[PDB]
């Protein structure tokens, strides 16, 4: 309970990173597809 905040922040950063990665992948694939 003392350090739950860093765990929440870390998991949020992981989810954000995965989302950014998928966004870049879709955008790049669409761009290279044209």
């Amino acid at each position: 309970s003392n350090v739950a905040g860093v765990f929440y922040i870390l998991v949020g950063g992981l989810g954000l990173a995965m989302l950014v990665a998928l966004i870049e992948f879709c955008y790049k694939s669409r761009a290279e597809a044209k």
Partner: protein
Amino acid sequence: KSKPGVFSFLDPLAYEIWMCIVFAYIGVSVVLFLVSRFSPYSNEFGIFNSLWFSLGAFMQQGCDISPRSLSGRIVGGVWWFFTLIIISSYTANLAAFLTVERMVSPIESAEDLAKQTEIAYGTLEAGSTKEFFRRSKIAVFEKMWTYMKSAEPSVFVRTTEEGMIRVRKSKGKYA
């Protein structure tokens, strides 16, 4: 003489924190590997080297490779923040432990016993000690007597062997 346990160096942090540290290490490494080796866009961040990088990050060592993408750098940054907080907390709580263990002044006189109350002290029910405390004109023993006859329920005792046994059974809670 309290024999320190092997793996007493883990005592500053609870078992749950270590468990979740391991879990977060695995998750961080997998997410790094993924966000580095998914897009057919090379990268040295496989699953073995992701684990290596995460481990070295946790120990504040650093390794040869470092992320170059936005997602990998987000992952590394949050892992770095987590590592910083956790290591600082470990060091600080260990310092707290040792400092407190260094403050501890045991009982060495009647006054030390008198002021504190975490330990109970009582003498024989009938004897010269009870009379000596009752009929005392001294400050410290007056305070003891004021405490004495309290709701231990029974600090007093009937037999000396009874007092010795009671002290032995009590885990330092009786004097």
